[PDB]
Design an enzyme around this catalytic site. Sequence first.
Site, PDB file in Angstrom:
ATOM      1  N   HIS A   1     -11.483   1.217   3.466  1.00  0.00           N
ATOM      2  CA  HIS A   1     -10.818   0.526   4.552  1.00  0.00           C
ATOM      3  C   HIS A   1     -11.667   0.580   5.838  1.00  0.00           C
ATOM      4  O   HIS A   1     -12.516   1.450   6.017  1.00  0.00           O
ATOM      5  CB  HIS A   1      -9.452   1.194   4.845  1.00  0.00           C
ATOM      6  CG  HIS A   1      -8.437   1.068   3.740  1.00  0.00           C
ATOM      7  ND1 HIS A   1      -7.105   0.929   4.078  1.00  0.00           N
ATOM      8  CD2 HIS A   1      -8.480   1.048   2.388  1.00  0.00           C
ATOM      9  CE1 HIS A   1      -6.408   0.909   2.950  1.00  0.00           C
ATOM     10  NE2 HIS A   1      -7.192   0.942   1.898  1.00  0.00           N
TER      11      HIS A   1
ATOM     12  N   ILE B   1      -8.103   0.690  -8.798  1.00  0.00           N
ATOM     13  CA  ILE B   1      -7.177   0.701  -9.937  1.00  0.00           C
ATOM     14  C   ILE B   1      -5.972   1.508  -9.445  1.00  0.00           C
ATOM     15  O   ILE B   1      -6.072   2.698  -9.167  1.00  0.00           O
ATOM     16  CB  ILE B   1      -7.821   1.284 -11.200  1.00  0.00           C
ATOM     17  CG1 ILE B   1      -9.017   0.429 -11.657  1.00  0.00           C
ATOM     18  CG2 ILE B   1      -6.797   1.495 -12.285  1.00  0.00           C
ATOM     19  CD1 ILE B   1      -9.983   1.099 -12.620  1.00  0.00           C
TER      20      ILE B   1
ATOM     21  N   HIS C   1       0.843  -1.203   0.000  1.00  0.00           N
ATOM     22  CA  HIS C   1       0.000   0.000   0.000  1.00  0.00           C
ATOM     23  C   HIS C   1       0.872   1.244   0.000  1.00  0.00           C
ATOM     24  O   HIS C   1       0.534   2.249   0.631  1.00  0.00           O
ATOM     25  CB  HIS C   1      -1.033  -0.024   1.138  1.00  0.00           C
ATOM     26  CG  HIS C   1      -2.371   0.547   0.783  1.00  0.00           C
ATOM     27  ND1 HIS C   1      -2.554   1.755   0.136  1.00  0.00           N
ATOM     28  CD2 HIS C   1      -3.621   0.035   0.936  1.00  0.00           C
ATOM     29  CE1 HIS C   1      -3.884   1.919  -0.077  1.00  0.00           C
ATOM     30  NE2 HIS C   1      -4.559   0.899   0.396  1.00  0.00           N
TER      31      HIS C   1
HETATM   32 CU   LIG Z   1     -10.372   4.295 -11.014  1.00  0.00          CU
HETATM   33 CU   LIG Z   2      -8.496  -2.237   2.167  1.00  0.00          CU
HETATM   34 CU   LIG Z   3      -6.977  -2.667  -1.104  1.00  0.00          CU
HETATM   35 CU   LIG Z   4      -6.598   0.307   0.103  1.00  0.00          CU
END
Ligand SMILES: [Cu+2]
Ligand SMILES: [Cu+2]
Ligand SMILES: [Cu+2]
Ligand SMILES: [Cu+2]
Length: 499
Positions: A402, A455, A112
């Site tokens: 999240h 994306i 991430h």
């Molecule tokens: Cu997008």
């Molecule tokens: Cu997530």
């Molecule tokens: Cu994710």
């Molecule tokens: Cu995420």
Amino acid sequence: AQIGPVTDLHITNANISPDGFSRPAVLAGGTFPGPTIAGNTGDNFQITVFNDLTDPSMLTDTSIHWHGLFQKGTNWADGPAFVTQCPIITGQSFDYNFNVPGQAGTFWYHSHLSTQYCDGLRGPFVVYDPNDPNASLYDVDDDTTIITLADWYHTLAQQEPIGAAITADATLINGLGRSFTNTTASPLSVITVQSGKRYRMRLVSISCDPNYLFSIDGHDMTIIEVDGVNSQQLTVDQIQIFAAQRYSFVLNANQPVGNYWIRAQPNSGGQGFDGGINSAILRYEGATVEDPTTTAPTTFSNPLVETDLHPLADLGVPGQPFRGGADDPLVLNLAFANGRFSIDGVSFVPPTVPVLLQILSGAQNAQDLLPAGSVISLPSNSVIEVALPAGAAGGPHPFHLHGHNFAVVQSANNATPNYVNPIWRDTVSIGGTGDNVTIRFTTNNPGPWFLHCHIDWHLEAGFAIVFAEDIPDTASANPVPQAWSDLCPAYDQAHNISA
Ligand SMILES: [Cu+2]
Ligand SMILES: [Cu+2]
Ligand SMILES: [Cu+2]
Ligand SMILES: [Cu+2]
Ligand SMILES: *[C@@H]1O[C@H](CO)[C@@H](O[C@@H]2O[C@H](CO)[C@@H](O[C@@H]3O[C@H](CO)[C@@H](O)[C@H](O)[C@@H]3O)[C@H](O)[C@H]2NC(C)=O)[C@H](O)[C@H]1NC(C)=O
Ligand SMILES: *[C@@H]1O[C@H](CO)[C@@H](O[C@@H]2O[C@H](CO)[C@@H](O)[C@H](O)[C@H]2NC(C)=O)[C@H](O)[C@H]1NC(C)=O
């Protein structure tokens, strides 16, 4: 073998050739995809991540998120860089130590930081239920029934040139597949089944971008789980799966012993199946070791339509049964222009101080929080509605929140909302021009939770905001370990950043 719930996980650079083309990668556990991390509902996961990366072309820092796990009371372990932590620097390690109460299903983990998960740091994450209400619907559910769908690029993520269209070079199913151009007859994945048995296939999109039209010649698929949420049985013969979504489906090995094509058609990149692109093999025990000779239909009979899905449990919908019938009803203006995405006029650029650290240091309104205009407060113990009207270029955009799942009150390509029994999930396509995909949830999880397009190229280009849920209770609810407190000083020193 599956690893966890307590495990080390080393992040390394290596060469791989999943489609016959060699390139360097960022790997968890030495493989693409990474090994499955698993445990049971309610378990304590302690994933001690060792950053051993040395190649700066794919970034030597890292941060890992556990996609779909709510992290209640452990917001610091969530992983989004500059939202909940500073990245882990090379030669250091960090224990993501969290629990999974009340969740059981199919998840995944991924870098991430930047577009680094595209370079290879992605793998399945399964939370089994010893008392699964769906247990009697299948016989086999193990590492051999996980199916990952991945986009794979020859060009490194950081080296995608500014101003040129980004598309993948191969579809990988369980890590293998063939390149769209210069196709070579590299090995395809094989999924093996025994005639007469029933399998819980855990279908995981680990995509950085495309959605896939997933099917298995000769077979149909009975959906029983959607992004961690148990569903009523829904039989389909094709699943359009967007980036980061998951389904479990029952596969009944009820066709003649033989070989059947597994198909995963991305919405961009190579179209069709020439040379065995976009393909894997379903092989029955006792079948000849040879490629399938099956074909797809021209038109599928029973494609998945999201409004057809319903929870297995009586989950309902929070709030009142009309648009705006929530304590905090929001409508986001989602736009793209000139290479950047924006939400309500603001393109996301990660801050120097992670949002969580800014909150813990005493910044207590969202107008105080950086990046300015990118952090929106949510009130505690409240029904939230978020309308996500589509239209921004590069669709259909899969939006993910999240810290939460949500009721999908309105789905793509259908103007009718459902305030009774829609599916709940964590990643939803917002559809096409004129659509008004809308989600609802209740705020019972204090902390900063990222809301973004999944994306990854669009996230990098700013298609995100942070919901600072219950700012006042964030510090009391999320005590932080010393190792977390050490992350930003170590990162800022390594990078010569003052703050
Ligand atoms: Cu997008
Ligand atoms: Cu997530
Ligand atoms: Cu994710
Ligand atoms: Cu995420
Ligand atoms: C577009 O989305 C709407 C909303 O999700 C879908 O409408 C829903 O359609 C279902 C299926 O026909 C309706 O439920 C069925 O209701 C009948 C009672 O008339 C009941 O006998 C069945 O057991 C079944 O549950 C549901 O009431 C309806 N909801 C609303 C709010 O209209 C619609 O099907 C979607 N369109 C397409 C083309 O899929
Ligand atoms: C999507 O639905 C939202 C409500 O959930 C709509 O929001 C309304 O927008 C109009 C102006 O366009 C405002 O006057 C209202 O205050 C908004 N909230 C309401 C009525 O509850 C939004 O227009 C819808 N968007 C699309 C593209 O259909």
